[PDB]
Symmetry: C2
Subunit: 557 residues, 2 copies
């Protein structure tokens, strides 16, 4: 029979199915933190819920050792002092294994129904999650709310819809009847059982814990697997809150709450994670993080299906424009948003050394560079007007990388530290913009984490496009952006995007930035290049997380 | 625009889509070699086409070194002396790369249409292909025709249908319009381009070259990839004919025929294959063969998506039956078919040491074992009555393993050499049936390729089922078969199949054998246990062979 939570959320599920196929605009979760949607005291109650976690041990009723763990620090300088019960990998693998049977037996309608109920409760907790994302990742509140709450919930629901889209096409049974020409037909009844892989592992991200973490977590749950969530040690709380709500729904639905457990760690957890990632019980791994750690998992966890999001080189090709100032302002927003700490933020900006055509005539390379650098300075230089745009720097390693990057080319706009007006100890810095030549490719085919960008002089737009496609294919990329008023250049940009396996944005001169993507329309990554071996989300992202075990028996024709 | 070959075969495509979802019986390719369907001279014309390949170099217009290659031998003792143009991996990778662009740009309707047209022509060549399978794999003619022709074509069409099932869900474009609170809406046009992975590699099998080879080949083609087909050096001709016909269709459709090339080799090609499998241009690999080689590819060809069919331990659990003679005969056919050289053939037969309940009373262990051994002897001992059932032994290594197996336990039925009445030099051997105890685990968890089986005494059906599920999960398995009249035992067998990740057959006492599987209903392998990392066929089998590259641009709102 159909699980009650499936029937409760069936309309939302059906709408999501239509959304992934039509790929227009759709979102069931209000992205604006409006009192109309979330209540007049939504913000206040959320903030108090966040504050209640500080200076205390986060309660989880999963098997735990009696020791605690946790060293999260707020980029805004707020004391956190949050602790979590320390569980061993052994203990969590055992608890997941004990939880697998009744979860599996409840079948797809339960996996989908429970997943959608959890998403409904996570949306209700959006403010509490927003504050927890802000004070672990450093995202400004508005972005922490959207990226940590509704937008992450959108991507989670997208994954559930893709899961259901595959599951719903597999019949529970079939009558197989083959005529035997005047002899009686062969007739058998086939029965098909959906069997999840087993236990999945979610290895969390330090900048977008829920947005990057949710697709794998809910792809696992929607296909009947159990999940161990191992967040980035600098951003545990958003996923601890998530796990708590998931366990509530599973417990109320009559399942073992250890279908989902939380493995909190402190930094230097590498040996622990390597050993856990190779355990025979771990059949799925979803990882967001460094290229070296991601590729390590792909090459060594042979017992698991490994899905990875890694670093890439995001690129802008500037050929020509209808309004240099509008293009420059859009690029500047894209560089300043969360201080370039988005996996989709642009890094390399290719401009012909001889300049570009504009509506107001020709612009030299130097004029294009000054237009970008000046627009960044206008957006970021004033603390009162810019802190909500640039947010806070995630870790103390960026300051050293900023100074390293200063030496790499010619400085167009220096990075400076700002004093946040509301957080005296916040770690805040404006973007660094450098000038390079195409001859310096050794410097710009690297990913530079933080607010660092290179305006790079090329021989021609043809070279910009050849290089951009080559670098995306070889070194990975999540986004590619082109500015041109010429149809043939736009066509060549599509060829480069196909070559590079990277999503293309064209003439972004308004309110859409290359950093942004919408669930149910935009594939996040392609899975074709070294920045990620999977796309968020498509059929391939979910279709392997379950198997089908059949049986056959003769029946009457 | 819709390719003409897509429109031509659209009705077959739509019916195949409906078939994979409902999973009843359906096949567009007639499995009987009937004159009604294939012409009154279908067999004769097919045999003449087969003979034309003997004693000459197989013609392909792909890049070649001028040298030839090929050392195929017929298990029936017929002189083949077939050679193929020798090409290097380097040359074929370059030729595929040059063919990729215009093939990719023609888009899904061309990939599907060309694939369906190739399948139509392969069906018309079924007799020629049947003879080529017979004289490389040793399959008797009827199985060579069905398994090499129509049934393989069924599985190819199944793979194309699953591919199209994913491709058709992706819009070519979308109008994305997002309302803005009292401001102009954000309006963008999205465009989605389906991009193949690149060049796929098909690593062929010596027993079922087309049946095992076609799903990967046509999944590759139907998703726009180029393909290098590397057959097993003992069974090239069936895939050489296939590649020839594929290239014909591609050429006639205005494509570079090097979308599909043939890399024929001589034996001991393992190092060449390793080097090829690791090339950065090889993005997909479909492999059928040993567990060790398949495992090597999964672990070391990290740049490719690897789909493998490997070895496993196929098992029968005998608990009880309503007709021992009928059950024994069915098991006997399953052991005798193609001399146990099917990847789905049973090897281990578990029987309680204290016997079983039947409808005609109690039967001892020795009575069950003798029932099986005697039914096998009746079906296989006489050349004239058995040759069309047991076929020929593929290579002399199977003969060696039969003799190794003789020493392992108590022989219930010895394997004999038969003189084929029509092929004086054919290699024909009857099944070897041995008795073991459950304590002999070290022996019966190994794979014994060939007509070798063990009737194994267990403490109870409880132990039989626990052992079968454990062995399937640890060592891999393609089939599990259970005989019981008890509902609780059937329930336990379902649990064992789920644990072992293996398809279950229940009370096969008639004309369906555990060896058999039908496209569009039976998943061949699950992908859950060590016998295979993929199922033939499902969504996971095709959904990763293409990617989607999108673009977005602002447009006017509606
Ligand atoms: Na950046
Ligand atoms: Na066998």
């Amino acid at each position: 029979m159909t699980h009650a939570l499936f029937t409760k959320h069936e309309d939302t599920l059906k709408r999501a199915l239509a959304a992934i196929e039509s790929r227009g605009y759709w979102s069931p979760f209000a992205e604006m933190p409006s009192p109309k949607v979330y209540g007049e005291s939504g913000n206040a109650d959320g903030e108090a819920a966040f504050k209640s976690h500080l200076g205390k041990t986060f309660e989880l009723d999963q098997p735990a050792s009696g020791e605690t763990v946790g060293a999260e620090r707020s980029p805004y300088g707020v004391a956190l002092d949050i602790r979590y019960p320390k569980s061993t990998p052994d203990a969590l693998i055992a608890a997941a294994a004990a939880a697998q049977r009744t979860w599996r037996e409840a079948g797809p309608s339960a996996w989908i129904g429970v997943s959608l109920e959890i998403l409904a409760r996570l949306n209700r907790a959006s403010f509490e999650i927003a504050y927890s994302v802000m004070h672990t990742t450093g995202q400004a509140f508005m972005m922490a709310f959207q990226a940590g709450g509704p937008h992450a919930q959108d991507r989670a629901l997208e994954a559930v819809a893709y899961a259901w889209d595959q599951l719903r096409r597999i019949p529970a049974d079939a009558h197989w009847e083959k005529p035997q020409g005047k002899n009686p037909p062969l007739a058998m009844q086939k029965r098909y059982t959906i069997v999840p892989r087993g236990t999945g592992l979610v290895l969390g991200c330090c900048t977008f814990p829920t947005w990057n973490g949710y697709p794998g977590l809910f792809a696992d749950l929607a296909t009947g697997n159990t999940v161990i969530v191992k967040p980035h040690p600098g951003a545990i709380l958003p996923l601890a809150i998530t796990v708590r709500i998931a366990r509530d729904v599973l417990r109320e639905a009559g399942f073992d709450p250890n279908v989902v457990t939380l493995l909190a760690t402190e930094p230097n957890d590498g040996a622990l994670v390597q050993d856990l990632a190779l355990r025979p019980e771990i059949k799925l791994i979803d990882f967001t993080g460094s290229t070296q750690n991601g590729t390590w998992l792909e090459r060594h966890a042979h017992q698991a299906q490994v899905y990875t999001e890694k670093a890439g080189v995001n690129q802008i090709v500037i050929d020509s424009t209808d309004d240099l100032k509008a293009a420059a302002k859009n690029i500047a927003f894209s560089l300043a948003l969360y201080s370039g700490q988005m996996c989709t933020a642009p890094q390399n900006i290719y401009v012909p050394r001889d300049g570009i055509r504009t509506a107001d005539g020709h612009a030299s390379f130097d004029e294009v560079a000054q237009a970008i650098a000046g627009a960044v300075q206008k957006l970021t230089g004033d603390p009162a007007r810019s802190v909500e745009l640039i947010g806070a720097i995630q870790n103390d390693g960026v300051t050293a990388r900023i100074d390293a990057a200063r030496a790499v080319g010619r400085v167009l706009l220096d990075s400076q530290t700002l004093q946040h007006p509301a957080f005296p100890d916040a770690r805040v810095r404006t973007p660094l913009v450098l000038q390079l030549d195409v001859a310096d490719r050794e410097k710009f085919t690297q990913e530079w984490f933080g607010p660092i960008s290179f305006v790079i002089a090329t021989d021609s737009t043809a070279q910009s496009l050849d290089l951009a496609g080559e670098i995306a294919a070889e070194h990975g990329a999540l986004t590619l952006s082109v500015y041109s008023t010429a149809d043939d250049v736009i066509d060549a940009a599509h060829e480069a995007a196909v070559r590079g396996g990277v999503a293309l944005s064209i003439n972004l001169t308004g309110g859409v930035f290359v950093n942004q993507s919408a669930a149910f329309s935009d594939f996040h990554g392609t899975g074709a290049n070294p920045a990620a071996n999977a796309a968020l989300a498509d059929a391939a992202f979910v279709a392997n997380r379950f198997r089908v075990v059949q049986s056959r028996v003769h029946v009457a024709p």
